[PDB]
Symmetry: C2
Amino acid sequence: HMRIVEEMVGKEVLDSSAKVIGKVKDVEVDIESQAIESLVLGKGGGETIVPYEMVKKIGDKILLKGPEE
Amino acid sequence: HMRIVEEMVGKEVLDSSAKVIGKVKDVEVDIESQAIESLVLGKGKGETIVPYEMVKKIGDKILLKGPE
């Protein structure tokens, strides 16, 4: 249960290497399943689309999983 | 497929009786099931929580409820 705008947005996404890929710009949703399918991140100064199946944890920051994870 | 914040936050949501319940200020998702919970409407400070269940269509506006 999370507020996309007020919460899960503007949130930094880190890859498994503790690097920051960017922040959450929006969230692509599949119209059918009414389900999430990917996060659209922002560079800053243009967009990166990361599959939601990559997200490992979502707390203060969003942690993507490793290649072996 | 449909981007959320972009093409869905801000749009007005209308009744079955073509009435304006409010505008979508936010949307909640069940980060586990990967499902959109409901829409959070700006008012008529206060908030209305429309079970995303209903939503019949999304165009320049959001249409909902019916005979079900």
